[PDB]
Each structure stands twice: as C-alpha cells, then as structure tokens.
Amino acid sequence: RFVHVKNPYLDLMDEDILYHLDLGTKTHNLPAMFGDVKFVCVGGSPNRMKAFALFMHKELGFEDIKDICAGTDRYCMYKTGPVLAISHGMGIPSISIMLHELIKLLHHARCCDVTIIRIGTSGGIGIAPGTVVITDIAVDSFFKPRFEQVILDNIVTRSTELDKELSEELFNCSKEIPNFPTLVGHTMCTYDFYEGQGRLDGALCSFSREKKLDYLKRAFKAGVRNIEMESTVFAAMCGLCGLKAAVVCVTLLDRLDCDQINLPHDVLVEYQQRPQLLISNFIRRRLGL
Amino acid sequence: RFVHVKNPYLDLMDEDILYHLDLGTKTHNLPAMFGDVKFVCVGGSPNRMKAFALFMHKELGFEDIKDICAGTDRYCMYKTGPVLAISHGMGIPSISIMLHELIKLLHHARCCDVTIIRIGTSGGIGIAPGTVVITDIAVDSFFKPRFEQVILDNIVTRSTELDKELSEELFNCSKEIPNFPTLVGHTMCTYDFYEGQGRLDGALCSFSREKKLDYLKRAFKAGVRNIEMESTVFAAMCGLCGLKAAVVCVTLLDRLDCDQINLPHDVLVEYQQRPQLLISNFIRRRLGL
Numbered sequence: 153r154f155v156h157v158k159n160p161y162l163d164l165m166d167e168d169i170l171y172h173l174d175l176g177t178k179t180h181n182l183p184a185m186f187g188d189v190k191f192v193c194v195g196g197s198p199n200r201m202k203a204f205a206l207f208m209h210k211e212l213g214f215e216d217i218k219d220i221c222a223g224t225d226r227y228c229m230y231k232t233g234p235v236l237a238i239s240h241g242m243g244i245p246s247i248s249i250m251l252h253e254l255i256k257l258l259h260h261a262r263c264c265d266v267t268i269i270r271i272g273t274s275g276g277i278g279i280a281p282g283t284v285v286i287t288d289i290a291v292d293s294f295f296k297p298r299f300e301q302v303i304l305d306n307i308v309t310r311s312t313e314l315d316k317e318l319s320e321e322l323f324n325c326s327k328e329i330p331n332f333p334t335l336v337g338h339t340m341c342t343y344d345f346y347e348g349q350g351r352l353d354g355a356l357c358s359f360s361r362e363k364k365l366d367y368l369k370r371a372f373k374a375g376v377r378n379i380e381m382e383s384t385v386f387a388a389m390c391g392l393c394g395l396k397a398a399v400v401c402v403t404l405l406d407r408l409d410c411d412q413i414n415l416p417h418d419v420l421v422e423y424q425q426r427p428q429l430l431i432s433n434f435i436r437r438r439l440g441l
Numbered sequence: 442r443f444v445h446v447k448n449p450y451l452d453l454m455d456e457d458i459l460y461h462l463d464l465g466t467k468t469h470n471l472p473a474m475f476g477d478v479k480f481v482c483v484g485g486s487p488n489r490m491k492a493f494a495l496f497m498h499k500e501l502g503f504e505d506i507k508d509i510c511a512g513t514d515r516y517c518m519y520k521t522g523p524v525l526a527i528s529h530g531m532g533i534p535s536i537s538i539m540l541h542e543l544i545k546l547l548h549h550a551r552c553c554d555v556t557i558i559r560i561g562t563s564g565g566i567g568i569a570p571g572t573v574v575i576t577d578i579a580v581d582s583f584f585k586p587r588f589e590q591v592i593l594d595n596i597v598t599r600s601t602e603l604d605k606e607l608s609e610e611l612f613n614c615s616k617e618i619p620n621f622p623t624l625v626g627h628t629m630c631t632y633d634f635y636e637g638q639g640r641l642d643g644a645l646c647s648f649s650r651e652k653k654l655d656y657l658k659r660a661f662k663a664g665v666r667n668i669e670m671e672s673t674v675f676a677a678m679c680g681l682c683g684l685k686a687a688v689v690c691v692t693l694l695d696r697l698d699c700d701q702i703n704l705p706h707d708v709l710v711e712y713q714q715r716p717q718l719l720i721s722n723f724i725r726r727r728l729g730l
C-alpha cells in the first residue's frame with residue numbers, strides 16, 4: 153500500500169521544494185532518508201514530539217537527537233528506525249501545511265504500508281480527565297463525519313473515515329497497560345478553542361452556560377467523547393493518500409464541568425505522556441519487540 | 442480607548458488562567474506588567490518575533506531578551522518599553538487562541554489606546570516579489586470582507602474592517618524609506634496554503650492551471666493584492682475589542698507566475714525584514730523618536 157499524491161502537476165515539476173519543512177527533491181535524497189518509514193507520529197508541541205522521539209528511541213531497544221527540519225522553527229522532525237516524529241502546531245491550517253508536504257515527502261521516498269497516528273490532548277465530554285480516547289470517527293462542530301474546505305471559489309467536502317481495524321488494534325493494545333483509562337469514541341474537531349468549543353472563558357462569548365451545556369450533551373448523544381482541533385483534516389487527507397490513520401488523544405478536563413485547564417504540573421505531565429505509552433506498545437507489537 | 446472583552450462570564454471568575462500563554466491573574470500582576478503597552482506586534486515565526494523585539498529594543502534607543510511565555514513552546518512574548526512582540530503560529534485557529542488570551546490579558550492590565558499590527562509574509566498577485574502590502578480590507582476566499590466562524594451549532598459572521606486612518610498613516614510612513622516598495626490593497630485570508638490558495642504543487646490538486654489563473658485574476662479584479670492565512674480573524678477580533686489593527690505583509694513571490702517559494706537566502710532574509718522597518722518608523726514617529 154503505497155503513499156500516493158492526488159495531483160497530476162507534481163510529476164511535471166523538475167524539483168519539489170518543501171518550503172515549510174525546509175526539505176527538497178534536489179537538496180535531499182528522500183528515498184534514502186525516508187524509504188524505510190512505517191510509522192509517523194504527529195503532535196502539536198515541538199518539545200513534546202522531541203520527548204516522544206527520545207522515548208521511542210529507548211522503546212525500540214536503542215541505548216541530543218537532531219531535528220531533520222532544524223532550519224525552520226515552523227515544524228520539527230525526528231527519526232528513530234522506522235518511526236518518524238513530527239510537530240504540526242495548532243489548528244487545521246497548521247497541520248494541513250505539514251500533511252501536504254509530508255504526503256509529498258513519503259511519496260517521493262516511495263514509502264509503503266505507512267501508519268500515521270496523531271497523538272495529543274483534548275477536552276473530554278462526560279469522561280474522567282486523563283482518559284485516552286482512540287477516535288473511531290472524526291466529526292465537525294455539527295457532529296457530521298466530513299471535512300469541508302474552500303478550494304478557489306468552491307466548497308469541497310471530504311470523508312473523515314479513520315481505519316476501523318487500526319482503532320480496534322490500538323484499543324486491544326491499551327487493555328494490557330495498567331492504570332491506563334481508554335475508550336473508543338467520536339472526536340469533534342473545531343476551528344476555535346474558545347467560542348468554537350462552547351467555552352465561557354474566552355475574550356468573546358455571546359451564548360449562555362445553558363446553551364453550551366445543551367450543545368455538549370447533544371454532542372455526547374451523537375457519540376462525541378472528546379474535542380480537539382486537527383482530527384478531521386488529518387483523517388480526510390491521510391485516508392485519501394494511502395496512509396492508515398489513527399487519533400489517540402488524552403483528555404485534560406471534562407467539559408460538562410469546566411472550560412479552564414487547571415491541573416497540578418505532575419498530573420498534566422502524566423496525562424500528556426499517556427498517548428505515547430499506547431503508541432510505543434502498538435509499534436513494539438507491530439515490530440515483534 | 443480601552444481594550445474590552447465581550448463576555449459577561451469573565452467578571453464572575455475568581456481567576457483567569459491564560460493556558461496557552463502560561464500566564465494568569467493569580468500568578469501574575471498583569472496591570473503592572475502590561476499596563477503601559479501601546480503597541481502589539483504579531484507574527485507567525487517565534488525566531489522572527491525574537492529578532493523583531495531585539496531590533497525594536499535598539500530602535501527605541503536602548504543599548505539575551507527573556508520570553509515572558511518561556512514556559513510554553515506554543516507562543517513566545519517579548520516586551521521592550523511600550524512594545525509587545527508575540528508569535529502566533531500558522532493559520533486562523535492558532536492566531537485566534539493567542540488573540541483570545543491576549544485581548545483578556547490587555548483588558549486585565551486595563552490597557553488603552555493600543556495599536557496592534559500583524560507583520561509577516563504573503564503571496565503576491567500581480568505585484569513584484571518583496572512588495573510590502575498594507576491591508577486596507579481583509580477578505581475571505583470569496584473576496585468578501587467577512588469572518589465566518591462556527592459557534593456551537595451556528596455560523597456567526599463578523600466584520601473584518603481595519604482602521605482606515607492607521608493604514609493611511611503606515612503608507613505615509615513607508616514613503617520616507619528608500620528602496621521600500623509599498624502598496625495599500627486588499628488581502629485574502631485562506632484556511633489552506635495549497636488547495637486553498639490555488640497552488641498546483643500540493644499533495645492534492647483537482648483543478649487546472651487555467652482555473653487557478655482565472656481565480657487569481659478575479660481576485661486581482663476584486664482589489665486583492667496579497668494572500669496570507671491570519672488577516673480576517675485578526676481584523677474581526679481586534680476591531681470588536683477596542684484595538685486599532687493593521688496588517689503589513691511582504692510578498693515572497695507573484696502567484697500569477699508560480700506556487701513554489703524559490704528565493705536566494707539573503708533575498709528571503711531582506712524581504713522578511715521589510716515589515717519590521719515600516720513598524721519601527723511608525724512606532725518611532727508615534728513616540729516622537
């Protein structure tokens with residue numbers, strides 16, 4: 153299963169400059185650097201993805217680690233064996249830029265049988281803080297499994313279907329881990345952290361506590377268990393380009409109780425490190441380690 | 442002219458935790474730290490905003506500089522006199538999170554007569570690469586001066602009107618600078634860098650070169666001179682909250698010729714530093730320096 157691009161113009165170009173990743177087909181040997189990539193792990197925070205790469209290095213059995221995108225502060229990239237770790241910033245536009253350049257990179261490198269997993273934090277709906285949610289379906293603010301984007305003057309809608317067997321395999325992996333609360337459920341992706349997630353603590357708020365609670369309860373009823381900001385564009389682009397995608401997010405709070413993240417530093421760090429424990433278990437099982 | 446929030450729930454909270462800025466009303470004395478802020482300058486790149494703060498420090502007459510948000514890799518913040526320099530990442534969601542927390546911060550600090558200027562890069566339409574565009578009107582992909590966002594289950598539309606006299610004053614400032622190509626024109630804000638700006642070099646492309654050229658020419662006809670990814674949410678939030686906003690972007694290429702940014706390193710650095718020259722001139726004139 154090869155990673156493929158869906159653009160007939162790429163083939164016509166003499167060189168491909170991955171401007172935001174500060175990489176290129178002329179300046180770099182992409183099949184030699186990335187041809188053996190089988191696992192791509194993406195998160196927002198560059199410090200957290202650096203820590204994930206260092207963690208995976210030890211989990212793969214090996215005994216500081218160079219940013220392949222050291223030339224740019226937009227994104228960071230680390231590679232340990234068949235595992236690629238990439239930061240993507242916050243929001244649908246920031247991850248979309250990364251995904252466009254990454255899908256082109258994996259296709260130039262002729263990668264195949266690639267699993268890509270978004271790891272991060274989210275807000276929970278009716279679930280205990282620190283719960284790990286494996287997304288089965290990524291939905292928009294209207295609880296619809298679709299990704300809408302504007303291309304020129306037109307709105308184009310794409311499917312956000314995530315690989316079902318991969319979400320089942322990640323859940324089966326999670327059961328072996330002690331003190332690891334895990335759940336398979338829908339994930340709602342929004343464009344705004346504050347008004348877009350029904351928060352009452354933003355600079356702007358025109359709705360009531362009752363209106364936000366009714367909204368969150370309807371989301372729970374539609375099967376939504378967590379809220380984040382990258383899942384729909386991630387699921388839509390990866391599925392379409394030959395990548396088996398998954399979303400594994402830890403919850404930092406239950407939105408049916410509050411909007412402000414107020415956790416002790418050591419609890420926040422523990423929760424933040426829960427998705428990487430599952431991915432490590434999953435990669436180690438896939439590689440026979 | 443005080444910076445104001447538009448949320449009756451903020452007043453009811455005992456403390457306000459600015460989670461992404463790693464600041465708070467309980468942990469910090471916000472009126473003492475930021476009460477004298479009169480100029481806020483925002484850009485995507487943390488390295489570029491660090492360099493801007495160091496540059497402004499010397500331009501204000503003073504003879505390394507501490508990140509006020511050093512505790513988080515999401516955003517960076519530097520202060521030199523009445524000038525606040527903040528990174529905001531890429532895209533409408535990343536800058537929206539920053540703007541929500543920043544408007545709350547400036548309001549807790551009781552700031553007044555605050556000018557906020559987005560400085561950055563963009564793609565040009567029918568203008569020479571390296572041209573500085575001062576936005577008069579920020580428009581969406583449909584060339585409409587509006588900012589649409591999803592709040593709970595509803596779409597809410599806001600005005601993207603930028604301060605006219607401030608754009609005229611920045612243009613008058615730009616005329617004194619030698620070898621500084623400058624223009625006042627509309628700026629189109631998109632959610633996607635590739636398909637969203639009519640690029641033919643993304644991972645996905647379902648349209649033709651002719652369709653993208655027709656689109657860009659219609660944008661030029663509607664008064665659009667540059668394309669970037671943060672202007673509409675920036676103009677919509679700031680205007681509504683008592684901030685006099687402006688957008689000053691340098692163009693890296695003319696989109697009527699190409700999609701890939703291919704510039705010599707020293708030309709890219711020169712172009713990147715053109716918006717900060719104008720802001721320095723503007724702040725120095727405002728302060729009588």
Ligand SMILES: O=c1cc[nH]c(=O)[nH]1
Nearest residue numbers: 273274275379380381
């Ligand atoms: O509530 C939350 C917490 C983390 N990320 C989100 O998008 N929402």
Ligand SMILES: O=c1cc[nH]c(=O)[nH]1
Nearest residue numbers: 562563564668669670
């Ligand atoms: O073409 C460009 C260049 C910089 N930023 C953009 O949004 N578009």
Ligand SMILES: [Mg+2]
Nearest residue numbers: 221222224227
């Ligand atoms: Mg880097």
Ligand SMILES: [Mg+2]
Nearest residue numbers: 510511513516
């Ligand atoms: Mg910081």
